[PDB]
Each structure stands twice: as structure tokens, then as C-alpha cells.
Design a protein around this ligand. Structure first.
Ligand SMILES: Nc1nc2c(ncn2[C@@H]2O[C@H](COP(=O)(O)OP(=O)(O)OP(=O)(O)O)[C@@H](O)[C@H]2O)c(=O)[nH]1
Ligand SMILES: Nc1ncnc2c1ncn2[C@@H]1O[C@H](COP(=O)(O)OP(=O)(O)CP(=O)(O)O)[C@@H](O)[C@H]1O
Ligand SMILES: Nc1nc2c(ncn2[C@@H]2O[C@H](COP(=O)(O)OP(=O)(O)O)[C@@H](O)[C@H]2O)c(=O)[nH]1
Ligand SMILES: [Ca+2]
Ligand SMILES: [Mg+2]
Ligand SMILES: [Mg+2]
Ligand SMILES: [Mg+2]
Lengths: 439, 5, 54, 344, 428
């Protein structure tokens, strides 16, 4: 069995991390004590959930996870969390002086001063792994820690574990909830540095999940807790294959294989349905062919873009719950007609499908209704490039006047590294262009 | 201008 | 339309479905940058404390 | 109050719509690069659709359908009419065509099979060359312009010339009809009641083919390459009301029945085909767009589709009525303040 | 980035410093003796930011009181919260500065500055993690202006990586008839451009006009002027004092508010405008808090924001209200008056919402704008300055303490540069 370590970085990383491992523990029936009545492989196991949990003689199931924040406030809430007994002290790493939304401060200044403690704490988990397959990194694009320290950590792991796999869960910034004017700086900066050290990355536009949280759950001003329990339902759909027994996306290598032909173009668009309000006592039970179609309605995408005017390179359908393949292949036959799905002329125009019979669990007392069936589509469409365009226009506006640049230089970073990272991105929009449009 | 706290 | 590689189990199943075929930097090297910034920053702080000495 | 921008000033039409917008005291205009707008009269080409609908609390609308170039560019339209089942290759109202890339997905030349199917032919056949640039030639023997195609670098397409067009009298003149079509954010297909005939100035003779300007009915070729203009109709623009009366006193019919039904049909067929590809019903922004369809009628009063103009100009007369009409339907249905069209 | 050290210098400094502490003490439920007696627990969450703890869990402000005459500090110590302050943190001389920047910065103040820095150091070692310092002072007198800018220059030397914040009261003839105040102010500005990260431009011209026009007070007093400052200071530091998401520390605030190192002179606004007599029975609507907090009448800086462009804006709302509606009205201003925000800084308006409202109101709004129109303030002083300096008038008070004409010329010159820099980015 191959273990996965998930590394939660910064405020966004640690808070989503909780939405996840909270949801994980409801799905694998682990209690707030870390105790598991369903499990009988006490002390250790070769089960599939062991890829995300290690075991202790006392019978505790301990998240194979590391939490990091240059600010102690967030991780301190884990420590006294409803799920506190789960994690042990060594797993929760905290600094005192945070990065103040400055990429340079997180990477260079504060970053140098903790990198060798975290790696040491990651090493203590790698030395509890019989065949470590790699890492899952959770972070924001906008934060100081999230952007700055992450790019530092990724560089180190490509050295300390060169042949192991690294996958990203990244929060793309939206003015509607963002708390800094320079988040577009920290976004391009961290993407340029991190690109060659990430095998596959799942982007989530806060804008998208916000509007989904407004539209589908009738929430007026969605909190982060609202935004996060939604995300976790997505992330679970991605990871369920590693945690439960399946044949699709069974280890991290398969993700790159199935979703990433071009290594640089490793940002699959995730779409997910159904998102149902729990305040709706009775909710219409959406059939398989109904939620399969919703995978192509932009309103359900993790990033608002238009796949119709992009080409595909891969496409996965991950059904959870009451679904049989007959109903699936039926709806697949349908959509090829009604919808604009062009693939690249060097890829088969098809779909990889997977079913997970255990249905989507929901947090008791949450804003999501339990549904009998659900799907999560992972499409590597060039339409996601639209999100790089958005982000890059905002960058050029501010950098033409070197606005806020002095904050970065003052951390020791060079004004040329800005130029370096932007001209890298200007190639990515070209790569996405060469792949998906008619000349 | 005459202006006391 | 073609189904392929139907892999089954108790916890789920999977298959493929086709509709048409086709038609790095060093450990030290990192640290050389981490210190090139600690210097560039220590310098700009020398020039301030120098401007302040005046 | 509302905010809008402009990024195409070389557009005849939206210069007037921008003029009319500012006349309502409710539409402030912003700098062409301000992101906090409500409407965008974007650029003909390179229009960045990727940035629309990402401004919190701003409803955003635009005067172009992304994906609409598939119907308006020549080689694309063709590929669309044969590849799209809703319009069988066997299309009753679209002339035979084949896509043509020079020597430099070449449909070059299953096209030729069609020519020799007319070596058995006593049905005369003549095919055109027409291009992305406004700068086109026409002749029976194919090879002649295939050189003309391989000469220049642009991609081209070839299509049968309608050798028996309807001839307006007096004059024995050729012509074509331009109809203006408006599609809103809901995809209601609206037709402007007023149309125009781009009539030819001289009589139509199948004798001479080289730059003969009795073949082409463009405003640019009739004004520049002919001492013939305004003899019968000022501007070579015969509006519908006249064409209506002629067709009755001449052929005993109406514009409505002989031609307009077929026109209104091809419109519905084309837009409804492209509809799932471009509709903004469930998008984070909304779209609308004016189109100009060029039609050719023959002597059996059958209507054909020539090309779809994605950036059409209007007849001087109809500017004040149509540009006014655009604002009623396309902009103010989305942005309310405080008929001349026909739904299909 | 946890503890802040507060300092107040001179008459104005200590009066508003005192009023500031009076106000936030009441908001954090701290009594004059320093015990806690408040309901909500939001009141004690980030109490460690401005206060220290002692035996009996009493709360002592992290405040250093500085003056060159005992006057205002004797009055503050027998003021309302007088006995709340650390007795040892009273550091005063007897000679006075005689409204002279030179006396404050070079002679009478130099004689005292070391002793103050000792109390600064003692407080900064009690800090688990120090953010920086907020100073309150006037720019028009001698102690707060001259000694104040000296303390900054000295404190930047011991804590160059910390953040330096100031509440600086700009002089106006409408309130003071001391002729040399434009000298004192120009000299101070030169210092502030160089050695602060954030400076709240509290203009006594604005405060007087507000008191007289809007609040209809025909004989405005300092207490009236300070009630406005007290309100602003509570609001502006709210995002610092209670749990929040935006601009929650001085460094982050600086990073969001300061696009260029020199242009850190903020234009505060506040709503609803209140006098200590005003009733305020009718709480305002969210749309009313917004139309006002952007209204020039509510600006504490006496600039017309329509004459320049907002580089950045923070907007802080307090009290129980529709956070949904806050966003719409906030997004409304930006979209209505979009020409007045620079285009080359996307989403330059950021908003926070705290539940606990200010003393005596149900709904309050505080404005923090980095407008280029702030130059008008510096232009005002620049003119009042040159009017005298071209005739070298009243310079003998300064040369007599060791200064030279050249030092004036450079402070004149550096502030004219500041104005031009604020004008460079207003046409961008
Ligand atoms: N979905 C989601 N987004 C978040 C969350 N927290 C922060 N963000 C977003 O992330 C960006 C801010 O980055 P943070 O993670 O908060 O900052 P950080 O990583 O802790 O780094 P520093 O705070 O500078 O030390 C903004 O765009 C926020 O909107 C969260 O809990 N959930
Ligand atoms: N199959 C056909 N039968 C008859 N006439 C044809 C034809 N194909 C092309 N034409 C001629 O082409 C002429 C001009 O049409 P064109 O394709 O240039 O459209 P347009 O000028 O309105 C916009 P643009 O030239 O900018 O693309 C018409 O007058 C028409 O007579
Ligand atoms: N708003 C306000 N301004 C004051 C107060 N006291 C003095 N000033 C202003 O500050 C300037 C005088 O500075 P002051 O503090 O008295 O001199 P210092 O004691 O040497 O620092 C003048 O512009 C006064 O109007 C006060 O209590 N409130
Ligand atoms: Ca076990
Ligand atoms: Mg943080
Ligand atoms: Mg005095
Ligand atoms: Mg002495």
C-alpha cells in the first residue's frame, strides 16, 4: 500500500484541510477521537484508507498530514478543534510573524527561517511510510505564506523526494472575498516558481464557489466555512480513489497519466454536481443523466470559463453513490450531440469513468443536502486559460507603475524576478493557445 | 481665534 | 461507441468510453538564492542605518 | 445610471448607438479600458471574452457572440453547412461549396469531382474565388484561378455562380438583398422589417467575366467602376417598398411570399444551428449581436445564402430607425431605463 | 506582529492620546483602574494588542506619555483614566519647547529623548512579537512636532524592520494664531515622508470646518475637535483591535494602502458625524453611511477627493447590519464614481465589517483613503511657509538653536517633491 502525505500551507490551506479531514472522518467512520469501530486492522493495516491515515497501538487513526502557518492563530484552532485528539503536536507547525500578503516575505525572509523545521517534520512522516507515493499540497494563491512559502517547499521536495509525486490544490483569488490588493502579484510569482515542481494542480476560483454558494444554497453572504465544506466535497471526489478501493485514479501517478499530456498544462477544470441546499427539506432527486449534463454548465465549474471555445485533452467522470454504468454510458451518448466538445486531433475523443458506490457524505448541520448520487468531472480543457488571462491583465496594470513593488524588493527580492515570472506566464497562455484554437 | 478639552 | 477496460470491485467500477480516435534545480543552488536575498536585504538595511547615522 | 465602453470606432453602426446611448442621460461612457462597465461595444477582432462576467456586482453585456465567427468567415460557414447535420450537405438553399487551402484539412479537391460531373454537363457551371480581403475572379475553366488561389497565401473557397439570377427591369440588372438580423441574450431571432437591394447598375450579360462589374453588386465596385448610378435607384439601394411594388406589377407576387419566407427560413436555420455553441443563457456574461445576411434570388424566385456579415453597415436611411431599434431590444431589455422587428 | 507600542508627544499628542485611550477602553470594557467589566468576549480577544496584563489581571495600556513641560501630563494624570497609565511611563521635562521645532528636535528635546527611548525599550521587550509603533502628535507645535520626529528617526534606528504609524494633526490658521506653525509642519513632513510607513493626516482645518458648519458649533473647543479625532482613531484601528480579516495588522494595512514608499499619507473619513451634544437617536441606513463616508464633508483632511484619484481605500463598518448590503453599497460607489479610482490598481477598495459598534452609535463607518488629493493639504502648508521664508521671517528663533537656512530649504524642497509625486500618479 502506498501512503499519501497532504501538506496544508497558510490560512487557506489549514482551514480547507479541516473541511477535508472532517469530511474524511465522516466518510471513513473515524471519530473525533481518531478511533475507528469499522477498522479491525489495529496497530497497522494494508487497507486503502491507510494511505491517508497511520495507526497507533492505542487504536488511533492519525491523518498523514502536516499543517504550516507563519501565523499561529489558525493552526491554534486545530489544536483545540473538535477534531484535536486526531493530530499530535508535531503535526501542527506555527510561526509568530506572518508574511503580510507579501510573496517575497514568505519565500525569502520568513521562509528561510522555517523550511528546515517543516521538512524535518515531513521527514518524520516519510519515515512512517512503506512506499510513499507522494504529496498533496493545499494553499492559496493570494496569501503571503500560501504563495511564498509554498513555492519554497515545492522546490525542496523536488530535491528531498525527487521521484515522488506532488499534486496541488490552489485557491485562485476573487476580489469579492480577497483581503489584499497585491494578490495578483503573489499569484503570478508563485505559479512561475512552482510550475516545474507540480505534476497536477486543481484550481478553485473563490468567485465560482462563492456564486455557487449564493445560487445553489441560497446564502446571501457566504462565509469561508460555507466556501470550505463545498470545496471538501469536491476534494473528496478527487481523492476517494486513493482512500477507497477503485481501479481509476488509484495512485497519484495515474492523475498525471490520465489528465496531463503536456506537463506544463496540468490544470484540470473540475466541475461538480449536484449542489443542493439542506434548507430544502424536499429536494428533487436528480438522475444520473441530469447531473452528468450539469458537468458542462459553467455555473457548476470551479472556474468560470467556457469549455465550448476550448479543446479537451482528457476528461474524467467520478460518480459517487447510486450509479450504474448503463445509465452513465447512456447520458454520455447524449451529451456528445447537444454540447460543444472538441478534443485535440491527437487525443481520442472519449471519457474515463469511475464509480464509487459509497455516496457523498455531508457534515451534520451543514448547508449541503445529502444526495444519493453525485459526479465530479475533471476536464483538462484549454478554456481554463481564461483564468490566467484575467489574472495577468491585473498584474500588468499594477506593474506598469511598479505599484507596491517596493514592498517586495525590500524583502531582498529583485524587481527583475517580477519580469521573469510574468514572461513565463505569457508563454503558458501561448501554449494553451497553440493546443486549442483554429489557425 | 480663541479655541480648552 | 466503445467501452474498454471495465475494472470492477465491491467499492466501485470503472471503464473507458471512446467515440472517435485521434485525427530540477540543486539543493545548494536553492540556498544560493535564499542567501542572495538575505544579503540584498541586509544591504538595504545598512544603507538606511547609514542614512540614519548621518 | 449605467456605464458602457467602446473599442471599435471604425464601426459605422455602434458610433450611432453610442451616440443614442448618451442621449438618454442614463448612460455614462467610460475609458475604453475601464473594467467596471455594464456594456461593451467591443472590437471586431481579438475581443477578450475571457474577462467579462468577473466583476462583482456588475451585470455585463456585449455586442458579439463568441463563436459567431464560425458562421461569418467563408471557409468556416462552408465547413459548418456540411459538417452540421441540421443543415445536410444536401442543403436546398446554399450553393455547392468546397474549402480550399493553397500549395503553401484541405477539401482540395473532392471539388474537382463536381466539375467533371459537368463535363457530362450541358448545365453551364462557373465558380467564384472570393476572399477575406476586399480586393476575387470568376470563370468556367477551373484551373485558371486555382493558380490565382495558390498564388496568394490566404485560404479560399469555391462555389457555383448563379448563372440565372432574377433580373430587374428596366435595366436587365442583377442584384442582391441584405437583411439585418438581431439576436438578444435570450437568443430571440429578430429581423429588421426594412431591407435593401444592392442592385447592379448595368445590364447583366454572361459574355464577359473579367472585372465586368455587372457581375458584382458591391457598393464599392458600383460607385468606383461604373458611369452608372442613380439612373433607376439613387445609391443603387433599392429599399423593400419599391421592390415590393415592382414584383407585383411585374411578376404578380409579393416580397413577402416569393422571397421573404425563404429568407426568414435560412435565418432561423443558421442561428438555431449554432445556438448551443454560442448561447449565453447560462454564462457569467450575456451576449447579443447584429448580423447582415446577403441573399441572391434567381429567376424561379428561389433564395440562396451568400455570406453572413458579422460586422455589417447599414443604409443611411435606416440608421436612425435601426440603431434606435437595437437599443430597444438588445441593450434596454438588459438595462432598463425609467415594433420595427419580427420574432422567429 | 502582535503588540503595538503607543506614544503621545506634547499638548495635542497627549490630549488626543488620552481621549483615544478613553474611547477604546470603553469599547474593550476596561475601567479607569484597569479591571475588565464588559459583556462580549470579542472585547478581550485581541486586547493584548494595545494593553499589557498584570497581577490581578488588570489591563495597563502599552502607552508612553512624552512632553517637555509637565502641564498636559499632570492634567492627563488627573484626567479621567489618569491612574490607568503605567506611572513610570510618564516622561517629562520642565523647560518647554515654546512651539519651536528646533527646541523639540535638536536642543531641549535631545536633552530628554534618551530617557523616553528607555521606556520604549522596556515595553518592546515585554512584547512576544512587536509590530511597530503608533505616535500621536501635532505637527504645528514644538514638542510633538520636533521631538516627535526625532523619536521616530531614533526608533527607526533600533527597530528598522518594524512599522512606524502616526496620527499627525496638521496645523491651520483657522485654529491657531501662532505664526511659525507652517515652519514646524514643513520640517516635520520631511521627516514623516522618510521615516513612517503610515500617517493619518488629521487636519485641524477640516476638524474646525466640520465642527462649525456641519455640527453647527459656533465656538468650537478642543474637546469638540478631539471628539472627532477620538472617533476616527477608534474606527481606523478597529480592524486592528477586534477579530477581522482585512488590514488586521499594521504591516498588512501598509501593504494594502501604500503603493509607493513615500505616498503613505492617508485621508480619514467618518460617519455619522457626531458632536458630544448631538442626540443620534436615529441610526443611519447602510446607504447613508456610504454616501457620507465618501462625502468631502466627512473627510478629516480638508481635501476635495474629487480633485484627485484614490490609489487605495479601506472602509470599515461597525455594528450589527446586513453584510450583504454593505457589499452592494460599497460596490455601488466604486461603480458610480469609478473615474475617481485609479484604473491601474484593480479592486483598490477593500472592506471589513466588525460587529461591535462604537460607543453611543448603532451604525458607524470609518474611511481610510490614500487619495492623491492629499497634496492640497501639503500645498496649503507649502504656501503658508513660503510666504514667510522668502523674507526669512521668524527664522532667528530657529537659527538661535543651531539650525541653518539650508535645512529649511531642503525641507521646503522635499515637500514640494512630495506634492509633485502625488501629482505624477493622479494623471496615470
Ligand atoms: N476558499 C477559501 N479561501 C480563502 C480562505 N482563507 C483565505 N482565502 C483566500 O486566500 C487569499 C488570502 O491568502 P491567505 O491564505 O489568507 O494568507 P496566508 O496564506 O495565511 O499568508 P499570510 O496571511 O500573508 O501570512 C485571499 O484571496 C482569500 O480570499 C479560506 O479559508 N477558504
Ligand atoms: N454563387 C454566387 N452567385 C451569385 N453571385 C455571387 C455568388 N458568389 C458571390 N457572388 C457575388 O459576390 C458579391 C459580393 O459578396 P461578398 O462576399 O463580397 O460580401 P460583402 O461584400 O457584402 C462583405 P465582405 O466582402 O467584406 O466580406 C455579391 O454581389 C455576389 O453577386
Ligand atoms: N486637535 C487638537 N489640536 C491641538 C490640541 N492642542 C494643540 N493643538 C494644535 O497643535 C498645535 C500646537 O501644538 P502643541 O501640541 O500645543 O505643541 P507641543 O506641546 O510643543 O507639542 C496647534 O496647531 C494647535 O491647534 C488639541 O487638544 N487638539
Ligand atoms: Ca486499520
Ligand atoms: Mg495568514
Ligand atoms: Mg501651550
Ligand atoms: Mg537645559
Amino acid at each position: 500500500m502506498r501512503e499519501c502525505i497532504s501538506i496544508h500551507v497558510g490560512q487557506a490551506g489549514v482551514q480547507i484541510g479541516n473541511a477535508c479531514w472532517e469530511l474524511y472522518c465522516l466518510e471513513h467512520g473515524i471519530q473525533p477521537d481518531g478511533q475507528m469501530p469499522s477498522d479491525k486492522t489495529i496497530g497497522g493495516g494494508d487497507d486503502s484508507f491507510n494511505t491517508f491515515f497511520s495507526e497507533t497501538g492505542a487504536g488511533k487513526h492519525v491523518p498523514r498530514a502536516v499543517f504550516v502557518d507563519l501565523e499561529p492563530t489558525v493552526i491554534d484552532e486545530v489544536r483545540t478543534g473538535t477534531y484535536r485528539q486526531l493530530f499530535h503536536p508535531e503535526q501542527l507547525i506555527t510561526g509568530k510573524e506572518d508574511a503580510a500578503n507579501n510573496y517575497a516575505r514568505g519565500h525569502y525572509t520568513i521562509g528561510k527561517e522555517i523550511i528546515d523545521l517543516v521538512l524535518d517534520r515531513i521527514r518524520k512522516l516519510a519515515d512512517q511510510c512503506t512506499g510513499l507515493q507522494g504529496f498533496l499540497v493545499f494553499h492559496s494563491f493570494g496569501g503571503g505564506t500560501g504563495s511564498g512559502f509554498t513555492s519554497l517547499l515545492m522546490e525542496r521536495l523536488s530535491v528531498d523526494y525527487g521521484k515522488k509525486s506532488k499534486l496541488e490544490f490552489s485557491i485562485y483569488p476573487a476580489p469579492q472575498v480577497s483581503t489584499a490588493v497585491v494578490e495578483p502579484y503573489n499569484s503570478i510569482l508563485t505559479t512561475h516558481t512552482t510550475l516545474e515542481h507540480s505534476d497536477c494542480a486543481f484550481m478553485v476560483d473563490n468567485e465560482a464557489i462563492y456564486d455557487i454558494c449564493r445560487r445553489n444554497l441560497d446564502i446571501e453572504r457566504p462565509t469561508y466555512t460555507n466556501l470550505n465544506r463545498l470545496i471538501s466535497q469536491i476534494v473528496s471526489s478527487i481523492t476517494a480513489s486513493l482512500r477507497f478501493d477503485g481501479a481509476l485514479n488509484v495512485d497519484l501517478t495515474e492523475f498525471q497519466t490520465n489528465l496531463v499530456p503536456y506537463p506544463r498544462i496540468h490544470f484540470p477544470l473540475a466541475t461538480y454536481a449536484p449542489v443542493i441546499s439542506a434548507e430544502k427539506a424536499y429536494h428533487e432527486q436528480l438522475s444520473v443523466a441530469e447531473i452528468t449534463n450539469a458537468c458542462f454548465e459553467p455555473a457548476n465549474q470551479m472556474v468560470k470559463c467556457d469549455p465550448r471555445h476550448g479543446k479537451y485533452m482528457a476528461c474524467c467522470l467520478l460518480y459517487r453513490g447510486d450509479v450504474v454504468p448503463k445509465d452513465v454510458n447512456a447520458a454520455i451518448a447524449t451529451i456528445k450531440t447537444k454540447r460543444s466538445i472538441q478534443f485535440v486531433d491527437w487525443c481520442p475523443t472519449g471519457f474515463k469513468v469511475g464509480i464509487n458506490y459509497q455516496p457523498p457524505t455531508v457534515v451534520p448541520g451543514g448547508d449541503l443536502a445529502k444526495v444519493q448520487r453525485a459526479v465530479c468531472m475533471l476536464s483538462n480543457t484549454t478554456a481554463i486559460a481564461e483564468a490566467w488571462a484575467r489574472l495577468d491583465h491585473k498584474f500588468d496594470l499594477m506593474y506598469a507603475k511598479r505599484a507596491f513593488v517596493h514592498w517586495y524588493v525590500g524583502e531582498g527580492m529583485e524587481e527583475g524576478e517580477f519580469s521573469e515570472a510574468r514572461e513565463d506566464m505569457a508563454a503558458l497562455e501561448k501554449d494553451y493557445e497553440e493546443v486549442g484554437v483554429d489557425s | 481665534v480663541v479655541x480648552x478639552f | 461507441m466503445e467501452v474498454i477496460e471495465l475494472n470492477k470491485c465491491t467499492s466501485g467500477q470503472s471503464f473507458e468510453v471512446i467515440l472517435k480516435p485521434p485525427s530540477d534545480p540543486s539543493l545548494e543552488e536553492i540556498q544560493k538564492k535564499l542567501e542572495a536575498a538575505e544579503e540584498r536585504r541586509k544591504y538595504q538595511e545598512a544603507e538606511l542605518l547609514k542614512h540614519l547615522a548621518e | 445610471m449605467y456605464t458602457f465602453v467602446v473599442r471599435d470606432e471604425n464601426s459605422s453602426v455602434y458610433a450611432e448607438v453610442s451616440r443614442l446611448l448618451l442621449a438618454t442621460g442614463q448612460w455614462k461612457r467610460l475609458r475604453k479600458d475601464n473594467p467596471r462597465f455594464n456594456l461593451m461595444l467591443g472590437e471586431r477582432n481579438r475581443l477578450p471574452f475571457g474577462r467579462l462576467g468577473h466583476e462583482p456586482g456588475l451585470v455585463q453585456l456585449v455586442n458579439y457572440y463568441r463563436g459567431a465567427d464560425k458562421l461569418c468567415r467563408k471557409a468556416s460557414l462552408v465547413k459548418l453547412i456540411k459538417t452540421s447535420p441540421e443543415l445536410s450537405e444536401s442543403c436546398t438553399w446554399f450553393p455547392e461549396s468546397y474549402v480550399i487551402y493553397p500549395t503553401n484539412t484541405d477539401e482540395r479537391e473532392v471539388f474537382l469531382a463536381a466539375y467533371n460531373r459537368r463535363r457530362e454537363g450541358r448545365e453551364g457551371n462557373v465558380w467564384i474565388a472570393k476572399s477575406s480581403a476586399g480586393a476575387i475572379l470568376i470563370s468556367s475553366e477551373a484551373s485558371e484561378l486555382l493558380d490565382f488561389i495558390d498564388e496568394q497565401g490566404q485560404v479560399h473557397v469555391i462555389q457555383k455562380y448563379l448563372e440565372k439570377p432574377l433580373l430587374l427591369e428596366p435595366g436587365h440588372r442583377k442584384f442582391d438583398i441584405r437583411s439585418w438580423v438581431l439576436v438578444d441574450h435570450l437568443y430571440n431571432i429578430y429581423l429588421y422589417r426594412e431591407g435593401v437591394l444592392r442592385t447592379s447598375s448595368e445590364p447583366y450579360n454572361s459574355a464577359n467575366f473579367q472585372d465586368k462589374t455587372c457581375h458584382l453588386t458591391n457598393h464599392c465596385i458600383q460607385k468606383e467602376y461604373s458611369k452608372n448610378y442613380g439612373r433607376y435607384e439613387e445609391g443603387n439601394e433599392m429599399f423593400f417598398e419599391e421592390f415590393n411594388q415592382y414584383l407585383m406589377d411585374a411578376l404578380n407576387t409579393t416580397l413577402e411570399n416569393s422571397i421573404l419566407l425563404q429568407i426568414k427560413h435560412i435565418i432561423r436555420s443558421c442561428l438555431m444551428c449554432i445556438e448551443p455553441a454560442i448561447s449565453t443563457k447560462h454564462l457569467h456574461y450575456q451576449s447579443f449581436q447584429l448580423f447582415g445576411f446577403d441573399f441572391m434570388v434567381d429567376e424561379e424566385l428561389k433564395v440562396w445564402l451568400i455570406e453572413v456579415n458579422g460586422a455589417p453597415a447599414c443604409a443611411q436611411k435606416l440608421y436612425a430607425e435601426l440603431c434606435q431599434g437595437i437599443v430597444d431590444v438588445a441593450i434596454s431589455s438588459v438595462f432598463p431605463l425609467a415594433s420595427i422587428f419580427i420574432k422567429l | 506582529m502582535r503588540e503595538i507600542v503607543h506614544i503621545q508627544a506634547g499638548q495635542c499628542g497627549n490630549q488626543i492620546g488620552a481621549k483615544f485611550w478613553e474611547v477604546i477602553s470603553d469599547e474593550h470594557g476596561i475601567d479607569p483602574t484597569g479591571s475588565y467589566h464588559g459583556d462580549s468576549d470579542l472585547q478581550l480577544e485581541r486586547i493584548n494588542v494595545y494593553y499589557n496584563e498584570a497581577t490581578g489581571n488588570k489591563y495597563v495600556p502599552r502607552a508612553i506619555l512624552v512632553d517637555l513641560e509637565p502641564g498636559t501630563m499632570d492634567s492627563v494624570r488627573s484626567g479621567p483614566f489618569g491612574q490607568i497609565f503605567r506611572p513610570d511611563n510618564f516622561v517629562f521635562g520642565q523647560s518647554g519647547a515654546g512651539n519651536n521645532w528646533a527646541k523639540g528636535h535638536y536642543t531641549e528635546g535631545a536633552e530628554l529623548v534618551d530617557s523616553v527611548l528607555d521606556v520604549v525599550r522596556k515595553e518592546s521587550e515585554s512584547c512576544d512579537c512587536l509590530q511597530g509603533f503608533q505616535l500621536t502628535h501635532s505637527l504645528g507645535g514644538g514638542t510633538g512636532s520636533g521631538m516627535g520626529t526625532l523619536l521616530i528617526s531614533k526608533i527607526r534606528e533600533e527597530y528598522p524592520d518594524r512599522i512606524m504609524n502616526t496620527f499627525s494633526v496638521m496645523p491651520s490658521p483657522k485654529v491657531s494664531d501662532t505664526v511659525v506653525e507652517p515652519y514646524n509642519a514643513t520640517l516635520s513632513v520631511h521627516q514623516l515622508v522618510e521615516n513612517t510607513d503610515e500617517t493619518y493626516c488629521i487636519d485641524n482645518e477640516a476638524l474646525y470646518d466640520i465642527c462649525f458648519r456641519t455640527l453647527k458649533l459656533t465656538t468650537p473647543t478642543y474637546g469638540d475637535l478631539n471628539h472627532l479625532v477620538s472617533a476616527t482613531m477608534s474606527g481606523v484601528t478597529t480592524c486592528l483591535r477586534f477579530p477581522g480579516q482585512l488590514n488586521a495588522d499594521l504591516r498588512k494595512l501598509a501593504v494594502n494602502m501604500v503603493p509607493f514608499p513615500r505616498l503613505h499619507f492617508f485621508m480619514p473619513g467618518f460617519a455619522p458625524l457626531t458632536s458630544r451634544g448631538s442626540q443620534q437617536y436615529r441610526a443611519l441606513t447602510v446607504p447613508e453611511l456610504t454616501q457620507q463616508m465618501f462625502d468631502s464633508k466627512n473627510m478629516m483632511a480638508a481635501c476635495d477627493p474629487r480633485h484627485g484619484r484614490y490609489l487605495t481605500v479601506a472602509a470599515i463598518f461597525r455594528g450589527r447590519m446586513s453584510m450583504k448590503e454593505v457589499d452592494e453599497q460599497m460596490l455601488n460607489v466604486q461603480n458610480k464614481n469609478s473615474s475617481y479610482f485609479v484604473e491601474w490598481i484593480p479592486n483598490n477598495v477593500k472592506t471589513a465589517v466588525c460587529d461591535i459598534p462604537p460607543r453611543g452609535l448603532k451604525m458607524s463607518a470609518t474611511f481610510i483613503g490614500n487619495s492623491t488629493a492629499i497634496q492640497e493639504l501639503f500645498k496649503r502648508i507649502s504656501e503658508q511657509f513660503t510666504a514667510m521664508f522668502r523674507r526669512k521671517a521668524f527664522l532667528h528663533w530657529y537659527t538661535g538653536e543651531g539650525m541653518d537656512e539650508m535645512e529649511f530649504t531642503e525641507a521646503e524642497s522635499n515637500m514640494n517633491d512630495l506634492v509633485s509625486e502625488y501629482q505624477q500618479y493622479q494623471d496615470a
